[PDB]
């Protein structure tokens, strides 16, 4: 069987003076019963 395991990777902390980036898209989407989002076109 597959060994699925976890390992610690850091503390959860907001970073002051952080690199801010990315746009803010306004999208029409649907969510199906399998948890999958899709664009409404």
């Amino acid at each position: 069987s597959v060994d699925m395991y976890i390992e610690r990777a850091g503390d959860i902390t907001w970073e002051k003076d952080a690199e801010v980036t990315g746009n803010s898209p306004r999208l029409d989407v649907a969510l199906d019963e399998s948890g999958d989002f899709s664009l409404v076109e």
């Binding site: 976890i6 610690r8 990777a9 029409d28 664009l39």
Partner: protein, 155 residues
């Protein structure tokens, strides 16, 4: 074995490991996206963490206890993705969310693109509270990615 923090979710067979996702340990409960683990049990050191609650449609699963993360995006402020990409240390990326508009309401969404194994990385408000997990999203026309800010319910 359940110390608070962010964790990589790894798999291995007979050879090396692969990072399939990320999750959050808070209040003794491990939180990740369903598609990372498919609800399978997790090893933590010598211990076994069993899935407690999950929901395929929300794409979420908790281990050891009920979902604990209850902070909500305020619908206004910038947020930080605490990205934990495969093979890279955790890094904070600040962004102003966009919006997934659905028939059931609006969901904050972040236009930040990382490898598949970054799934489950937490998204934070300015107080450091986890307002959701990264990695259930959509691909837009130019091939870039937008992730919902996916949050569960704390009952």
């Amino acid at each position: 074995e359940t110390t608070d923090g962010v964790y990589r979710v790894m798999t291995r067979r007979l050879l090396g490991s692969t990072q399939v996702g990320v999750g959050v340990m808070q209040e003794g409960v491990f939180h990740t996206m369903w598609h990372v683990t498919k609800g399978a049990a997790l090893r933590s050191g010598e211990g076994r963490l069993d899935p407690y609650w999950g929901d395929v449609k929300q794409d979420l699963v908790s281990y050891c206890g009920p979902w604990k993360l209850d902070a909500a995006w305020d619908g206004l402020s910038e947020v930080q993705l605490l990205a934990v990409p495969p093979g890279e240390r955790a890094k904070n990326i600040q962004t102003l969310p966009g919006i997934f508009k659905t028939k059931d309401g609006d969901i904050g969404a972040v236009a930040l693109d990382y490898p598949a194994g970054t799934s489950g990385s937490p998204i934070l408000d300015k107080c450091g509270r986890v307002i959701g997990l990264y990695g259930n999203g959509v691909v837009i026309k130019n091939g870039s990615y937008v992730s919902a800010i996916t949050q569960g319910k704390r009952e």
